[PDB]
Amino acid sequence: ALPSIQLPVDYNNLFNEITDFLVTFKQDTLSGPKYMAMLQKVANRELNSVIIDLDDILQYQNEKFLQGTQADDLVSAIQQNANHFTELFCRAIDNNMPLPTKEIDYKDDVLDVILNQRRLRNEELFPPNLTRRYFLYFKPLSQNAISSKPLSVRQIKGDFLGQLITVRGIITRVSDVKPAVEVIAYTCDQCGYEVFQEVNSRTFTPLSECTSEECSQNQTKGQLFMSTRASKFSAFQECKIQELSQQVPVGHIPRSLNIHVNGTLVRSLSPGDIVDVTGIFLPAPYTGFKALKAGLLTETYLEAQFVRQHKTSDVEERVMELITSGDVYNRLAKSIAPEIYGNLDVKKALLLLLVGGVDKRVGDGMKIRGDINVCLMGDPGVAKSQLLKAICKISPRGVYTTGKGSSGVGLTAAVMILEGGALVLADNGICCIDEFDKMDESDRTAIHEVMEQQTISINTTLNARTSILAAANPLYGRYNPRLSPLDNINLPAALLSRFDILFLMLDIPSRDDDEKLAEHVTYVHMHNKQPDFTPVEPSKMREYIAYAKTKRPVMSEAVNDYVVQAYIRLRQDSKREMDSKFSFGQATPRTLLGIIRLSQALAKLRLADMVDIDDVEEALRLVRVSKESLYQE
Amino acid sequence: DAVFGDRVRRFQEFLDTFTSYRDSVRSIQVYNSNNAANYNILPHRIIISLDDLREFDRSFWSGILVEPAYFIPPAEKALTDLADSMDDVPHPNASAVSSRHPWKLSFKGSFGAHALSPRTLTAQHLNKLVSVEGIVTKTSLVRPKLIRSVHYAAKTGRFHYRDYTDATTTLTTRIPTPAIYPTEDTEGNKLTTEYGYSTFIDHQRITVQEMPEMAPAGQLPRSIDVILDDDLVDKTKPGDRVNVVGVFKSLGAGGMNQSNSNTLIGFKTLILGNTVYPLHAARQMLTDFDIRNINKLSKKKDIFDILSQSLAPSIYGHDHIKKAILLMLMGGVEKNLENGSHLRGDINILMVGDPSTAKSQLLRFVLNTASLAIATTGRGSSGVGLTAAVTTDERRLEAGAMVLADRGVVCIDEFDKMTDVDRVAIHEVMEQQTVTIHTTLNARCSVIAAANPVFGQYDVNRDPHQNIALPDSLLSRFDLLFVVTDDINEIRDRSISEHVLRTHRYLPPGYLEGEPVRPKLVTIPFLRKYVQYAKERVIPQLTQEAINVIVKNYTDLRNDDNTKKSPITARTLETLIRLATAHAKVRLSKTVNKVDAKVAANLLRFALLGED
DNA sequence: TTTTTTT
């Protein structure tokens, strides 16, 4: 029934090699042993988990090859049976565990106090897993291959079971954290002795009968009582990773795959971001009754080892490099959509929105949003959609949306228990709306509920803090000078006031402009790079945006007085400019607020500790250019 | 057993009689070794002619048909032994040795009574090899099986393994295996299941509805599930025709058990498919002789003209639209920049004409000429549906008509009758080459459009855009716009009447006059093969001269005050470059000729400013 | 239950 098959691997010698590697391996190339230092941290309880790097094992095997000693191929044997090798790794960690350099606070650890007492009363008494307070993990092998190469859900195969492997795909959902009894401790009063049971299955049958030798000697039939303070418990969480849309074949739906995340690895993931997680693919045993029907067919799962989501001194150095390159605001603006030619003012406004303004909350309770919102109004074929998609790609958490593609309620929060909508997915990001003119005013009301106050009201509520961007075509598909600017915008004055700035661009034939645009476009076609200033990398651009946001500049007396004078001037200019052809909308105290946020964003991009009158004038100039683009005609 | 050993020896004798089968098993093994070294490993499954097994031993072939459980297992064991002997099996993995993959056997061709349909399937076919063909339906999602629950007793040093068998998976009936991992080893040490060492083969059981045409009127087509394993799993999907060589198997108590008091239920019957064959009923096939002929055709002075004249040869007066259709069939070159900007590999053409102008007939001919095409009618077409589709199913997303055949061209009748909102959803396909709903579906498909004037009769006084229902932005989104409408001329009417009379006078070879049916031009399959060969072997790229020609053409289109079907744009410049790549693809040239770019710009000029 | 949307 059990035909033994000798295989070209010996677990004893492999574990001896693992224990040797734990003590010998050190980050000398990066520079006691590094693994020994991690073990000492775990002994101090400063480290609650262990992660064994497959690249470290490969480097140790290469060192053994240089020494001439034959490598046990530990890195490859991990790919062979990582689940089996993990127990040997834990045993080697127990063997090579240093004494705690720092006190473990054993008195606070009721389990430790009771463990000393139980050993004294007893004088593998308790499970080694119960003795261990750390969780093993495996770092994916460095590229130089199943673990190193990420896989899709459909790409994964049943042969990959028992093997460490990395996967790529959208996280469909994450199960709520639940306790997991790694070891259940049973206690019986009749014996006075504790009996431990180690649970390694999805479900367990309680002992329900005292196994204590004291109860056996007394002949009493004791009723075991589980103790939460004595039984080991570990957080258990599940994740559903679904295949990336590119990985999905045409005409096929991506498949979500359940993943088991336990211990310190629990709660690490968020559904919004794509994750590249290396984990030992393993079968999921069926229950008894369901397995009787399933037969040889078996369920499967993945136990994550190393989790990585796509999206300091180095960041500070990069920001300093951008500052040394200089003119950072205009440089980032030109870096936005380098393939697109022109629209530098729109790019600068987009960069200001990306940096955002300072969010202010008064002591009395008033809260003024610091997030900036922008709108783009342009004739067809002016790269409105292209610029919006480029901005969405620039935003790590931003979401691109279309007015016809998604309902306003669905974008704010799509009803199926509530689930986050496109705006919630745009939390700490920028929600982009393509063809915003086509979007219905009914959904625009839902957008207006959130633009003025970040929170969403439905009951269920979410903070929904984000920056709003909109791209709209002018009424009848193109701008009409006979139509007023407000008529061509075709938007509510509430929307205009909630928006910090709206940009109007017109398509006017021009020989030199056509020649320059054709030159840039032909250069882009013949060579993917734009002809010409070098755009900053998107990672450094996002880092600079975060560094600007960290500044949080405050207004000064001179800047505030100048902004008040500008507010009076704008109100008077609206009172005199009731002519619809020249009227862009009445002056707004809230708009001066939006102006305050834009000045704060400019001072953030300049990294000024306080807002500057130059920043306020630059924001006013952005609005002035928004009007002057139409004035030029 | 002993008969199974005799069958193993006889199947080894069959493999000796047909050296190609043993060579194919060894070729799978050698390819597996070479591909394991290079990195893509061939499954250990072998398909042989049923007539070949009959030639080796008619008794063996008929015996496999009569008792597949008794014969096919021993025959596959013989094939596996031959494969194990032939294979070098260098550096085998412990998991691979645990897998011990059997060499599957399948019979091909000459099925006869074994060839079957679900309605014609019989209880006598149960426990007998058969071949069943029908439309697939209700295919099961792939679920991993378990060849053996390999385990390892703790500290014992020995890996105890427990095999599991399934009656559907094994043609022979067997007492059910526990299918439960042992809690403790036979030695008494605690037993832990060995993941990885345990072997899991994907298993899928797909029902196969009888073909709806084969289904009797007043009756629903019968459906018989076919077991699939390893590569056979997920071989076909519901709604797709398939033929599977599989042994029908009686199964279950069928009311014989004491629990079934009524005993009305019959014994469960599930076919166990040795192999699954998807069936077209397409895709053109290219051979070396046809490739040399295609090279000669490209060497012809007007290769694009020859291909266009071959396209829709019976259609009259739409030859320029057919040249544009050949350019669209090439599609141009698709480019993905390091910046991420996308250049479309598809060209969209629109032609407006009165009903019975045969512009929609030319569009239908283009749908037939394309190996894959999407058909829609503007009165019955919704652009939201073309961009994406929604199924109630949680709801399951469905590809839109434009998203369907995302590489292939889409021919639309009455495109002017299609609404402007539908045209905006189509513009998402035309320019962005992708559709966003929050689900996103790629929509890079070419959109050939048959349309009619809004008045129903084209007017020369009316602008072409005014006659077209599409907006000027939509016309710009289209790579080409045409005005082919019905007209009355005397000589042309005599010619068209002679053409219709010639279509009537055309005689099918099998049907004589008075019997109902049922300068050189490449045959339609050969021209489809030429287009496929263009896309497969030629990737035209912009040259300096051709690029300058396209740029100057776009600049002059933007500069000229003469009326155009669509406003000139940088998108029109990109369309001119793509059409140049399409003409060069028809030419099978890696670099687009400057004259080819000028000819594509001439097609675009015929599309916009006027006939050119 | 509650959207969602096709009848």
PDB file of all heavy atoms in Angstrom, chain A residues 23-40, unseen atoms left out:
ATOM      1  N   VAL A  23      24.201  29.329  10.240  1.00  0.00           N
ATOM      2  CA  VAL A  23      25.302  29.880  11.022  1.00  0.00           C
ATOM      3  C   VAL A  23      26.393  30.488  10.143  1.00  0.00           C
ATOM      4  O   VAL A  23      27.031  31.467  10.544  1.00  0.00           O
ATOM      5  N   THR A  24      26.627  29.938   8.951  1.00  0.00           N
ATOM      6  CA  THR A  24      27.727  30.394   8.111  1.00  0.00           C
ATOM      7  C   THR A  24      27.358  31.599   7.256  1.00  0.00           C
ATOM      8  O   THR A  24      28.187  32.496   7.067  1.00  0.00           O
ATOM      9  N   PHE A  25      26.135  31.636   6.730  1.00  0.00           N
ATOM     10  CA  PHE A  25      25.736  32.709   5.833  1.00  0.00           C
ATOM     11  C   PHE A  25      25.745  34.051   6.553  1.00  0.00           C
ATOM     12  O   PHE A  25      25.281  34.172   7.689  1.00  0.00           O
ATOM     13  N   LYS A  26      26.284  35.061   5.877  1.00  0.00           N
ATOM     14  CA  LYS A  26      26.331  36.411   6.414  1.00  0.00           C
ATOM     15  C   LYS A  26      26.296  37.393   5.255  1.00  0.00           C
ATOM     16  O   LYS A  26      26.687  37.070   4.131  1.00  0.00           O
ATOM     17  N   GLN A  27      25.822  38.604   5.542  1.00  0.00           N
ATOM     18  CA  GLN A  27      25.778  39.648   4.526  1.00  0.00           C
ATOM     19  C   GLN A  27      27.129  40.344   4.428  1.00  0.00           C
ATOM     20  O   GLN A  27      27.207  41.575   4.489  1.00  0.00           O
ATOM     21  N   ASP A  28      28.199  39.558   4.273  1.00  0.00           N
ATOM     22  CA  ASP A  28      29.534  40.134   4.161  1.00  0.00           C
ATOM     23  C   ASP A  28      29.683  40.935   2.874  1.00  0.00           C
ATOM     24  O   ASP A  28      30.351  41.975   2.857  1.00  0.00           O
ATOM     25  N   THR A  29      29.077  40.459   1.783  1.00  0.00           N
ATOM     26  CA  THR A  29      29.098  41.217   0.537  1.00  0.00           C
ATOM     27  C   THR A  29      28.379  42.551   0.698  1.00  0.00           C
ATOM     28  O   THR A  29      28.836  43.579   0.186  1.00  0.00           O
ATOM     29  N   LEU A  30      27.244  42.551   1.402  1.00  0.00           N
ATOM     30  CA  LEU A  30      26.574  43.807   1.719  1.00  0.00           C
ATOM     31  C   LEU A  30      27.394  44.645   2.691  1.00  0.00           C
ATOM     32  O   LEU A  30      27.341  45.880   2.640  1.00  0.00           O
ATOM     33  N   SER A  31      28.151  44.001   3.574  1.00  0.00           N
ATOM     34  CA  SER A  31      28.983  44.709   4.539  1.00  0.00           C
ATOM     35  C   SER A  31      30.208  45.319   3.865  1.00  0.00           C
ATOM     36  O   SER A  31      30.672  44.828   2.836  1.00  0.00           O
ATOM     37  N   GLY A  32      28.407  39.145  13.709  1.00  0.00           N
ATOM     38  CA  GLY A  32      28.106  37.745  13.471  1.00  0.00           C
ATOM     39  C   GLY A  32      27.331  37.513  12.189  1.00  0.00           C
ATOM     40  O   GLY A  32      27.103  38.449  11.424  1.00  0.00           O
ATOM     41  N   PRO A  33      26.927  36.266  11.952  1.00  0.00           N
ATOM     42  CA  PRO A  33      26.144  35.966  10.748  1.00  0.00           C
ATOM     43  C   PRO A  33      24.827  36.727  10.750  1.00  0.00           C
ATOM     44  O   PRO A  33      24.259  37.019  11.802  1.00  0.00           O
ATOM     45  N   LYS A  34      24.355  37.074   9.550  1.00  0.00           N
ATOM     46  CA  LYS A  34      23.095  37.806   9.436  1.00  0.00           C
ATOM     47  C   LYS A  34      21.916  36.962   9.908  1.00  0.00           C
ATOM     48  O   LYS A  34      21.017  37.464  10.597  1.00  0.00           O
ATOM     49  N   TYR A  35      21.899  35.678   9.544  1.00  0.00           N
ATOM     50  CA  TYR A  35      20.850  34.791  10.033  1.00  0.00           C
ATOM     51  C   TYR A  35      20.938  34.629  11.545  1.00  0.00           C
ATOM     52  O   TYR A  35      19.913  34.553  12.230  1.00  0.00           O
ATOM     53  N   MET A  36      22.158  34.584  12.084  1.00  0.00           N
ATOM     54  CA  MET A  36      22.325  34.529  13.534  1.00  0.00           C
ATOM     55  C   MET A  36      21.828  35.808  14.197  1.00  0.00           C
ATOM     56  O   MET A  36      21.287  35.768  15.306  1.00  0.00           O
ATOM     57  N   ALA A  37      22.010  36.956  13.539  1.00  0.00           N
ATOM     58  CA  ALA A  37      21.497  38.212  14.078  1.00  0.00           C
ATOM     59  C   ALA A  37      19.974  38.225  14.089  1.00  0.00           C
ATOM     60  O   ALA A  37      19.355  38.683  15.057  1.00  0.00           O
ATOM     61  N   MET A  38      19.355  37.723  13.018  1.00  0.00           N
ATOM     62  CA  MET A  38      17.899  37.597  13.005  1.00  0.00           C
ATOM     63  C   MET A  38      17.425  36.632  14.086  1.00  0.00           C
ATOM     64  O   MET A  38      16.397  36.865  14.735  1.00  0.00           O
ATOM     65  N   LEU A  39      18.168  35.542  14.299  1.00  0.00           N
ATOM     66  CA  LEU A  39      17.823  34.597  15.356  1.00  0.00           C
ATOM     67  C   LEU A  39      17.943  35.239  16.733  1.00  0.00           C
ATOM     68  O   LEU A  39      17.125  34.978  17.620  1.00  0.00           O
ATOM     69  N   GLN A  40      18.966  36.069  16.936  1.00  0.00           N
ATOM     70  CA  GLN A  40      19.106  36.786  18.202  1.00  0.00           C
ATOM     71  C   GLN A  40      17.965  37.774  18.404  1.00  0.00           C
ATOM     72  O   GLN A  40      17.461  37.931  19.523  1.00  0.00           O
TER      73      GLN A  40
END
